[PDB]
Structures are given as structure tokens and as C-alpha cells.
């Protein structure tokens, strides 16, 4: 199938894994569990040019959990560089990540992403963000939390790899869902399982939704 190796790089805590998870399952992981070396995930998108598959190599940003480091970049066909707009040092290191990346991957499309724009006290000013200009990187402000611009990096990359600037995400057809009846046996457990659910509070009850 039409699939592309995507490497995702940037400092620890910038939101790389959370970003990928959001796209994978729809979930927002609140906890920070450091990535160990790399985590490879298949990610499919439906487009007016057919399906496009990214194999996302979600790499570790913490030096001590770096694993093979630039070894992960071998034969990457595209990349996302992530920083955290509430953390200046993460932007400062962007050239470092870029350097190590382009040494291995000389001519790939790359998106620079400034994550966590949902947070009121922004530190890396919009005006400051210029590293991408001389390097021909696409840039987006994003939030994995609020989903601000969350689709943009993948839409842009899909356009660049398929070579079609008019490429759009399209709604997948929706098969008729089945007519299933709950079976006698498990009906007892369904009550217990449901009970735990009702009495476990939904997260972020203060959001708009």
C-alpha cells in the first residue's frame, strides 16, 4: 500500500506522543510517560486521492531515553519537528533536532510544530518563530489538547508526498452497522461494568465540548 515513513522529533515533554495518540485513538493523554527510544505507529488517512498510510516513528526526546537516536531517521520520507511554545528551550533546540535530522534525511518534507498553544502564558512569541524560513519547513501553531490545527501537519505532508496541492481529507463511507442482541450470560457482568463507568467522573467537565 501507499505508505510513508514519518519521523517525529523534538525535546522531551513537547507533546509528540500525545499528538500521535490524539490522531490514533482520539484520546488526550494527560500523563507524561517518556517514550523509550521509539514507538512505531501506523496512521491512515482518507483522502480524495485514496488512503494514505503514515508509519509514524515517534521518537524519544529525552537524551537519556534516546536509544538509537539518528538511527531512527534512516529512510524517513517525511518528518515533524515539535517544540513547546510555553518552553523557550524547546524552540532553542529546534536547530539541533533539524541538524541531526537533515544529515540523515537530505530531501524530505518537514513540518515545524509549536505545540501547547492552549496554555494562556505563551513563552515563544509568534514573532520569534522564524527558523523554518531559510530551511523550507512548513510551520504550524498546534495544540494536541484543544486540537487547534491538529490535522494540518498531516494534510500538508500528504499533499507534498502524493504531489497534489488540492488533496483533501474526505469522509470514509460508513457500512451499515449490525443488528446484535445482548446474550443472556454476559448481561450480569454488563451491569457491574456499567456501574464502574457511571460512577467514574468524565474528565475536564469544565470544557465547552
Amino acid at each position: 500500500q501507499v505508505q510513508f515513513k514519518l519521523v517525529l522529533v523534538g525535546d522531551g515533554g513537547t507533546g509528540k506522543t500525545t499528538f500521535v495518540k490524539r490522531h490514533l485513538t482520539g484520546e488526550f493523554e494527560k500523563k507524561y510517560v517518556a517514550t523509550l527510544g521509539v514507538e512505531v505507529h501506523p496512521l491512515v488517512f482518507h483522502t480524495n486521492r485514496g488512503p494514505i498510510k503514515f508509519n509514524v516513528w515517534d521518537t524519544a526526546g529525552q537524551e537519556k531515553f534516546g536509544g538509537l537516536r539518528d538511527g531512527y531517521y534512516i529512510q524517513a520520507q517525511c518528518a515533524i519537528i515539535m517544540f513547546d511554545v510555553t518552553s523557550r528551550v524547546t524552540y532553542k533546540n529546534v536547530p539541533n533536532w533539524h541538524r541531526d535530522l537533515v544529515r540523515v534525511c537530505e530531501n524530505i518534507p518537514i513540518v515545524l510544530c509549536g505545540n501547547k498553544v492552549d496554555i494562556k502564558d505563551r513563552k515563544v512569541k509568534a514573532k520569534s518563530i522564524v527558523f523554518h524560513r531559510k530551511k523550507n519547513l512548513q510551520y504550524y501553531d498546534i495544540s494536541a489538547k484543544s486540537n487547534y490545527n491538529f490535522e494540518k501537519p498531516f494534510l500538508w505532508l500528504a499533499r507534498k508526498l502524493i504531489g497534489d496541492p488540492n488533496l483533501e481529507f474526505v469522509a470514509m463511507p460508513a457500512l451499515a452497522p449490525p443488528e446484535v442482541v445482548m446474550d443472556p450470560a454476559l448481561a450480569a457482568q454488563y451491569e457491574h461494568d456499567l456501574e464502574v463507568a457511571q460512577t467514574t467522573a468524565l474528565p475536564d467537565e469544565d470544557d465547552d465540548l
Binding site: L68, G71, I74, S87, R103, K134, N136, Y140, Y148, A201
Partner: protein, 1017 residues
Amino acid sequence: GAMEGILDFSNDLDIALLDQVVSTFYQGSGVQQKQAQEILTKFQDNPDAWQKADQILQFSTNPQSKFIALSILDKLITRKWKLLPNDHRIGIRNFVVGMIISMCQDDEVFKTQKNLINKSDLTLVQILKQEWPQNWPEFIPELIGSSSSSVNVCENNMIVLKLLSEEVFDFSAEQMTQAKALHLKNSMSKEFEQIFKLCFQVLEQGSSSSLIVATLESLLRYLHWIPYRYIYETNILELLSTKFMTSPDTRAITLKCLTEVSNLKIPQDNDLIKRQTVLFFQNTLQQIATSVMPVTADLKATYANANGNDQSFLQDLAMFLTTYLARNRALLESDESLRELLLNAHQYLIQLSKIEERELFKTTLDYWHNLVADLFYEPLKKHIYEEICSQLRLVIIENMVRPEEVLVVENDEGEIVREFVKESDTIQLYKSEREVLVYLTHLNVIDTEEIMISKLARQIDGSEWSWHNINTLSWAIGSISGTMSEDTEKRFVVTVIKDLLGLCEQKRGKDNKAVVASDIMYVVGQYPRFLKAHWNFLRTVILKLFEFMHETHEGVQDMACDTFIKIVQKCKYHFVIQQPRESEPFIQTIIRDIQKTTADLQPQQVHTFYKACGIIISEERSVAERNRLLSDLMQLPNMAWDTIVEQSTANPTLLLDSETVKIIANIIKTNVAVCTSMGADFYPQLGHIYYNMLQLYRAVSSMISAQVAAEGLIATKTPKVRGLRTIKKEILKLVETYISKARNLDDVVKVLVEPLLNAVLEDYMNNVPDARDAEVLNCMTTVVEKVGHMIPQGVILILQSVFECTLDMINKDFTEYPEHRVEFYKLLKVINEKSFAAFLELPPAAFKLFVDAICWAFKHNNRDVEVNGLQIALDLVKNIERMGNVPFANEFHKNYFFIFVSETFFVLTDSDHKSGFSKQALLLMKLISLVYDNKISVPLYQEAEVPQGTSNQVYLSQYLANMLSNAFPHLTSEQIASFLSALTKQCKDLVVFKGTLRDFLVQIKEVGGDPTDYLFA
């Protein structure tokens, strides 16, 4: 299973098995790939693993295997090189060089193994950083010689020199000591003469080669640092600006070199150099016009098509043109023979600025701002650019982004709806566009008006009608406010509004109406000066906004409220006075009808509306009248309040009602809103509700506690309990808001403080952790900030009530109770600044926890906590020093001086706290300087630990050397000694001190660091 075998080193390395594991990782999937990954990481991390490196390079049939082999060496070279026996160093150098030579001679391997060859070069360069040129003097000459022998080797040499230049000049600041960076820069500099010679020859004997491309790649790096003469005193500008511009595979890199050249350090008064700078630009523009596209070409369309490398090229062109012109346009401005060039270059920029690419647009807009700002000031320049500016006016007006105030947007179905969210990322773009457009208007106000008015006509007659066109136009019209004379503005704005109304009269349906509404609202909100001169008009505008407050279209409704307050913020004076031919100040009218007007608004919109009224009322400086207006404003919330207070007093059950909770919350929020705008003036209204409000705080607190007892912690998640806490939180917010603005501090202390503390502290202290409001802490910070000095016993009370219980919530990890965590340290900080005595009163055990708390803050990665932790520490030290030679100061130093020093070193040296480096360094410097300046009156060492005579200076060195020696056992004694000597001497010069710290941080990452590096000056 079988895979793990390669981790066993006592067995000889099965290379075949390695390749399987590698391929499994690279081309595999799911569980298998994952297991291979872990395996390979462990293999790589094995400290003997490098010994297998030659075996792998020699025998592997898999390039990723060798790549990984090279990563293993790289790790060894960069970190453990000088620990290796000399022969392993020779041998490693040899097989790296040999592998490179070998891979360059076989054209197939050279052609199809670029990744592995690039890795090999980088690895080689790592060896050069260690060994060159002191232990490898001939490397440059031999590289130069080797180059003429083979096209492949020569090209690959260019890769190597590029990498070397990078590692020495571009990326050395973070990665090497100051001394070693200087050594390598100096070394490269001393031999660059010969490097350049080769680079020039190669460039002269080829046209469109991978070798040429490679050479130019290296040249781009050199341009960061080389002396200007290499650029200006050779033929190189000619080659770059002509020959290398013509072929497309060299054009990209050449343009980037030329951009960098446009940034060289270059004499100001040298007429011939000037001429050379004109000539390369002239050449370059000529090649573009004849080899790529003419000035008339539709770059918007070209970019949009996205063929080959067109986007990148256009991006690089924009960068070249803007860079060059920003520095040099003046060279082109006075000489008539250069006029066409100047304008042509700018015409390309005009075409570039039409491209649909936001990031690219920002790059060109930055340039336009640079241009127009200069034309605004510099005599006799604007006429040159009059036609360019005229075109630019069109471009900006037609690409105005949606202002933050325009709350309606069109959805995917052609519907005008309220926005789901703020377009946070177009805020800076709008400001940038406005700024440029504002300058353009000043530069030619006739042209700007003629353009806008005539565009408007083509909306009316239908010729160019569309939501996009009316929008961008309206936004632009609003954005130029302040540029015209009042008189011109008068006529201008009159025309615009008549026309917008006429336009609205024509259009029909809810979507059209929403759009034109939003545009009119935006425009009127942008012209307060006009509004102030046109009372009748202003009054009619406000009444219309009130009508919109009943709109079923929510975007329009919401925008009406924002527009109302926006106008009031600027025009409030005209609402407070009685206007001619009016029977009352308009504020009176607004208040009288407030229930009708706000009937259909959401609560927060109602609060905004009340906030706006507060702004107006605060204009009334007569105290009696102002208070009367305030009273009148608060009539509805105060009557709701009075009735609620009766009910609560009668029985606590009614508060139980969910509807009642919401009513109460909205009353308090309304008070918060009005207090926000009236500040100090709000006091009488506060005094009306204050005692019952604190009673209600208590009643509601009991309810929460009761609910938790009855239902468990999970009760805190319930609508009921969140609603009850909202009440508490809003009450805290109201008091905080008032106190933050209070002008009568005596009344704060005499009337507000005692009942507030009584109501809030014990409740906080005696609730379970999950039921404690962080807002209490936030409220107390403001109380301490504003009246802290006047309430020493009160501050003691605050500490007692919140310190130990809050610390215990936050001291098990870095994540739980994030709000408490942040507010806790802000409170500690202000207390430490304003009422340090409160800490003096603490029992010694609680004072120890205080010191623990501070250091705990250090270790946070969370900047909000970390920063405050470092400040508190610095402040505390100051507070102590200030006490002078008294027992508490002496005991403090005896107990805590070394705890602070070692803790500060810990976060400095652990690589996990890099964000705090500056404040850490400042703290460390202060601490060291205290000893260096004999500012500690007692021995820091317990007796018999050391000889009696011994100075604190000697002992401090001794403590630190020992600390570092155990903490970093791979350092030598001399490294440590030299580091401490340097550091202690430099404890008065923060910039030098910091550099010595950074050098230390480099050295601890490797073995055999040179101790003399600390002599750098």
C-alpha cells in the same frame, strides 16, 4: 528469543543474526519490530559494543547495521575517547578513514550508499574534534592532495569540510568548552586559505555537478564565518550570480550562498565593494528574468501548482530579495541607472506577496514593514516607491486576515456561524498587516482612501460582491483608524457607514445579515474618535447593539456585547454626562432598562454588560453621585441577594437547591465583573454584601464537607459540589479583585482582613486535600502583597493555616495538585519578600520544611514553580544576610548554607533543569560570594573537622572538591581543582562565572577534559 542472542558477548558476534535483527527493526512490524528495537538499543548501549565495530563494518551485508556500528563509535569517540589506550585510537582512526576511502573508490557503493557515507564522514569529523590538528597536523593538506586524485573522493571531502565547519562554527557553543571552540576555530582559520583555493578551483572547472553542488553546500557553511576578502577579492560573486544561477540543480544552493553573502561584515565607505554588491544583485536578477520567470509572471499560480521545487525556490527568492534589499536598497536609490533594477526586484516581491502561503507572506510582510517604516522617516525616499506602495496597498487590503473581534465565520456548508474557537494563530498576523497598512496610509492617504471607497462601490453595484470581499475590505477600513485627519475621517467614515447600511438593505437572509452586521460592528468599534464627536450617531449605534443582544444568531449577539464594551472603554465619558437635547445621562437610561436589554444574554455576557456599566460609572468623580449610580446598577443582583440571604439564614437546606446555587454564583460573578472595572470605587457595594457573603462562604463550606462525608471524595466531581465550590471560588475572586485595586488600605486591614482570614483559613486547613481551593492561596497572595506589612500576626496565621498542609499535598511528586503547587510558591514568595519576620517566628522544624520546600521547587521542570523556587532562595539568602551577625543568621548558615549550594549544583548538573540555568547560576554566585567576601561570621565547619584557624574559603573549596569528586568520579582532581579556582575567582562577574559553569557542564559529559580550559579569558 533467538534474537536476544547477540546481547551475549562471551559468545562471538553472529553478524548474520545482527542483520536479521536490524532488518526486523527497519522493515518489520508490530511485536517483532518492537522486540528487535529493544534488543538493538541494548546492544548499542553496551560499553564493550564498539569493539565489535570493525567486525560489523567489514562483514555486514546491511548498511543500517554499519550505520548502527558507526553510532556506537560516535558515542565512544565523543564521550570516552581519551580513556582508550593509544593503539585503539590509532586503529579506530585507521578503519574509519579506510572505510571512507574504500566506499569512495567503488562508484556503485558511492552512488547508492550516501547515508552510510555521510554517517562515516560525520564519525570522522568527531575524531577530528578530538585529534586535530595537534595530533593530526597533515589532515588538511592530505585532504587537498587526495581531492585531485578522484572526483568521488573530492566530492566526499567537501561533505567532510562542510560537516567540520558546522561542528566548529555553527554548533560548538553548546557542545565544547570555550577554550576548545577557540582552538578549533583558530585551527580552521589558519588553514582556510588552502581550503578556499580548492573550493574556488573546483567551482571554476565544472558547471552542474554533484561535486559542484557539494562544494557550494560547503561554501554556504563557510560564509557564516570567513573573512569578507575571500568573497569580494576573488571572482566568486560573478560565478555565483551568473554561472551557478543558470542550472537548476545548482541554483537553489547558490541563491542561499548569495543570501548569506548579503550578510557579510562589509566596509561602509568603500565605493568599489559597493559596486560589487550592486553587480551580484544585478546579475542575479538578470538570471531570474531570463532563466526562470519574468517579473510579470503569476507567482501566486506557480506556487499553488507546486511543481518540482518551485515552492522552495520561490521561498528562497523571497528570502534573498528581502535580505539583500533590507541591507542594501540604498545602494540602488540615488543612481538613475539602478532605478529599474531596484523597482524590478521590488516588483518580484510584490508578486511573491500575492502567494497563498501564510508563513511566506509573513516573511515578505516583515520586509514591507521594514520598507514603509523607513519611507515614513527617511527624507526624499517615498516617491521612489510610490507605484510599488500603491500595488502593496491593494495586496494588503485584499489579504486582511479576520480580526479577533469578528466572531462570525463561514462553515463548510456555506453558513455564517459563531466561531467554535479563537483563531489564536492569526493574532500576530493581523497586527503585522495593520502596522504595514497604517504606514501605507500615512504615506499616501488620498490613494488609500480612493482604493477603499472605489472597492466599496463595486460591492454596492454587485460587480465584486461576496462575503470574502466585503469582509477583507471592512477589516482594512477599520484597521487604518487613526491615520486620517478627524475631518477626512469624518467624511470617510460617514460614507463607509451609509454604504454598509445601503449594502445591508440590499442583501437578505440571516447569513448575509450576520456578515454585514459583523463588519459594521467592527468598523464602528474601531472609530471611537468619530463616535465621541457624533452623539446622536453613537446613541443609535448602542441601541442597535442592544437589539442584537436579542439576536437568535449567537455570533452577532456575542459580538454585540464585545463591541459595546469596546466602545465604552473609549467613550465612557459621553455616557456619564447629560448630552444636549437629552433628558438624562445615557448611563441612567442603560441602567433603567438593564433587565429588558440583557434578558436573552448568556450569564457571562450579562456580566460583561455589567462590567461595561462599571466603566461608565467610574467616570463620575462626585462620590455621592457615583455611589448612587453603583447602587442603581446593582439593584437586581442586590435584591436577588437580599432574598437569598433570608432563605439561607432561615435554613441551610434551600442552598441545597441546584437552581439557587446557580443564582448565587451569578450574583457573585456580577459583583466580580463590576468590581473589575470600578476597582477602588467598588467599596460601598462590597460593604453592602460583605458580612453575609462571608457567612454564606461558611454555610457553603459546611455543605461541601457534609457531601464529601456522606458520598465520598467522588462528591467533589458532582455538579452540586462543583457549583458550591464555584460560589467559594467567586467569593475569593471578588475579594482578591477588590484588594488588588484598593486605595484605602486602612479599611482593608480594619474591616476586610480579619473576617476574611477567620472565614477562609481554618476551612482550608481542615478540609481533605481534594476539597481545598487553590484560590484561597491566590487570594492570600494578594492580601500579603497589598497589606502584608500592616498585618504581621495575620501573615503568621496564613502560614500556620496553609503551609504544612499544602506542602504535604505537593511533596510526593511533581504533578499532583498543579494549581496548589503554583499558587503555594507564589504565596511563599510574596511572604518572603514582604513579611520575612513571619518565617522568623516559625518553629525550627517548620523552618526546615520551608528550606525543603524551596529546594523541592528547584527540582520542578514546571517553569511556574521552578522560577519562583529560585527567586525565593535568592531572596531568602538576601533576607538572612540583611540580619547581619546575629544568632539566627549564624544558625541558618551553619544549617542550610551547604544544603543550598549542593542543591543548586545538583539541578545545574543533571541536564533536567536547563531552563533554570541563569537563575541557578545567579544563586550559586551569590552563595559563593558570601564566603569570598567573608560575609559569614561563623565557621561553616563543625569543630575538629578541620584546623581551628581555617578560613571559610579554604573549607568551601574543600567541601566542593569532595562533593564533585564523589558526584563525578570520572573527573580528575586537577579538573575539579581548576574548575573551583576559576569559579570562585569569577564570583563577582556573572557572565564569566556562567561561562565557567557551561564549560564544566561540557566536561562532565566526557573523560579527559583539559583542566587548563578553566583559564579561558
